[PDB]
Design a protein around this nucleic acid. Structure first.
Ligand SMILES: [Mg+2]
Ligand SMILES: [Mg+2]
Ligand SMILES: [Mg+2]
Ligand SMILES: [Mg+2]
Ligand SMILES: [Mg+2]
Ligand SMILES: [Mg+2]
Ligand SMILES: [Mg+2]
Ligand SMILES: [Mg+2]
Ligand SMILES: [Mg+2]
Ligand SMILES: [Mg+2]
Ligand SMILES: [Mg+2]
Ligand SMILES: [Mg+2]
Ligand SMILES: [Mg+2]
Lengths: 101, 88, 73, 119
RNA sequence: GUGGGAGAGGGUGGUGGAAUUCCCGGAGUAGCGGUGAAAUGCGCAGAUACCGGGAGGAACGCCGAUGGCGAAGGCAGCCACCUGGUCCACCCGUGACGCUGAGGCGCGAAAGCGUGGGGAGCAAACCGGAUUAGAUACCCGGGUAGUCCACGCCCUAAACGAUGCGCGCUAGGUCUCUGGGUCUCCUGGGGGCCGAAGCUAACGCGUUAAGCGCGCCGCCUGGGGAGUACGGCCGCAAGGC
RNA sequence: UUUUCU
């Protein structure tokens, strides 16, 4: 397998119920696709550089998983399905390239 | 891709003796491996012509190695093929 | 004369590969969502090539503008 | 008639005319003018003067609506662009800000022969 | 072989934003557009300019280089997967296993062809306006094939470095891309420039040779007739050899 | 704008 970084941005107008709901479908999603969460970050609402789905804000996530490469694509096929999930970018982990360090 | 595992598995698998990394048998084994992964990858992707040139070179290099092998030890030859699956 | 102060100097160490460090990335854009040339970034062939890629990702994650309106004038 | 007080001043400058559309804080056009709206008919239309007049005019009609403050949005390069701007700066309107917002493709449609060849 | 590295190399899927066009809604009104001037054209069934929403096609701005990758054709939004080549380090393994290559096989820009699909923008032909002594043109308004996708053909080119491939040998200087080291220098791979010797009709070339040498392939033998005629092979055709 | 021949 390999180390991936799953970024997800969803509807910033979700109530604690709705918000915790999508995070559930996400969790099952990752699961049903052999994605083992190594660690997670949740910055929450952030100011977008430009509207995304008419909305001027976004609720960001960040699940660093470890799963089968042969399914990363399929994993996102699913994640993008959620109507509130308006952005899914799965990136291969990469050693940070310092600079002016 | 061929992982370090899968690879060295083959290396030892064909090595002439402890520590044999590049003998005709090993080399031919490794090439055969790649040729198969690649030949496979091209069953799908009939249009990846660039990789196909890779395959063409790989096959050639194998042909040469064997040609030499048979020339030298015709027995090790018959052995290698059979063991592998070449000439087919 | 592209000699004010390369965005590099005016900045501590950082991971050019970080597609979320907006606060830092923002620095490499102009008065528009445009990526500064090297005379500006003060980066280097290899670095700049990364910066760019990174910047694009941020762009997509609605974290960095693709373009901005020019003021003054 | 509605009385808008403050609004936007879109300047569509170009190598062929220049046209001004004053608008409300929501973008809905109040009044507009242009080289043609004024006397001018053809070539003369794109001159920087035909722009000054079109600007002041568009501005006047804007005053009558109650306009006093405006935000300028320049679009396109063309004679009469920076003129239109000065025409406005004057007038009975106050120019709050100036912004260049000309549209530029991130390379999408093939231009007609007239404009091909570059890069 | 082990351990590193850079890359618009390739194939599949997905996906992002800017712009054009069209559509719907708003607000607004008399022109817009176009040129050397104009006119055709579009607009009061309300165009242009401005805001909001939708659809669709095609191409990816900055980064971008005097840069990189590939055998060539040629390749640049972003993501994942699949996949070729290549450089460096260690000196670990095989032990001359090498070079070239008639024929064959494959690849091969654009246009072009067949089947199906798609079609925003552009636009041979074509339909108009204008310019002109004329204008089967250059300029302007429209516009079909096509440009796009898939599958199958075609195989050409200023397919150019107008420079076949491989190896060895022959001052340096300077810039640059990528790797290593005891890293203001040294060492390797690549891209440029100036130049030793030398070569060249000259222009110029000059460790990225067009220098000095060996191996193998391809090709030339005054111009026109003519890349024609004939024959053959190939192609659906155009037409190619 | 265009703008032949000798
Ligand atoms: Mg590789
Ligand atoms: Mg040894
Ligand atoms: Mg020995
Ligand atoms: Mg074509
Ligand atoms: Mg066709
Ligand atoms: Mg047209
Ligand atoms: Mg035309
Ligand atoms: Mg072709
Ligand atoms: Mg060099
Ligand atoms: Mg000399
Ligand atoms: Mg020289
Ligand atoms: Mg003769
Ligand atoms: Mg026939």
């Amino acid at each position: 397998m390999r180390r991936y970084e799953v970024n997800i941005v969803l509807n910033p107008n979700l109530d604690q119920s709705q918000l915790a709901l999508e995070k559930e479908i996400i969790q099952r999603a990752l699961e049903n696709y052999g994605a083992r969460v190594e660690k997670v970050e949740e910055l929450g609402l952030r100011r977008l550089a430009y509207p995304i789905a008419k909305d001027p804000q976004g609720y960001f996530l960040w699940y660093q998983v470890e799963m089968p490469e042969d399914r990363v694509n399929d994993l996102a096929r699913e994640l993008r399905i959620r109507d509130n999930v308006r952005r899914v970018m799965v990136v291969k982990s990469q050693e940070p390239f310092l600079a002016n360090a | 891709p061929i992982t370090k595992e899968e690879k060295q598995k083959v290396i030892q698998e064909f090595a002439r003796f402890p520590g044999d990394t590049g003998s005709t048998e090993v080399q031919v084994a490794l090439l055969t491996l790649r040729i198969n992964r690649l030949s496979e990858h091209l069953k799908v992707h009939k249009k990846d012509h660039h990789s196909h040139r890779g395959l063409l070179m790989m096959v050639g290099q194998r042909r040469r190695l064997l040609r030499y092998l048979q020339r030298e030890d015709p027995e090790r030859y018959r052995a290698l093929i059979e063991k592998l699956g070449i000439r087919g | 004369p592209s000699r004010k102060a390369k965005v590099k100097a005016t900045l501590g160490e950082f991971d050019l590969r970080d597609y979320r460090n907006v606060e830092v990335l923002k620095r490499f854009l102009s008065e528009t969502g445009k990526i500064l040339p090297r005379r500006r970034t003060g980066l280097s062939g290899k670095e700049q090539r990364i910066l760019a890629k990174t910047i694009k990702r941020a762009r997509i994650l609605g974290l960095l503008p693709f373009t901005e309106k020019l003021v003054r004038k | 008639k509605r009385q808008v007080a403050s609004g936007r001043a879109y300047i569509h400058a170009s190598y062929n005319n220049t046209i001004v559309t004053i608008t409300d804080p929501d973008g809905n056009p109040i009044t507009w003018s242009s080289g043609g709206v004024i006397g001018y008919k053809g070539s003369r239309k794109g001159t920087p003067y035909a722009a000054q007049l079109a600007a002041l005019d568009a501005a006047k009609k804007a005053m009558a609506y109650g306009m006093q403050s405006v935000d300028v949005i320049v679009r396109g390069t063309g004679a009469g662009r920076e003129q239109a701007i000065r025409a406005l700066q004057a007038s009975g309107l106050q120019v709050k800000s100036i912004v260049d917002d000309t549209p530029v493709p991130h390379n999408g449609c093939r231009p007609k022969k007239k404009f091909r060849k570059a890069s």
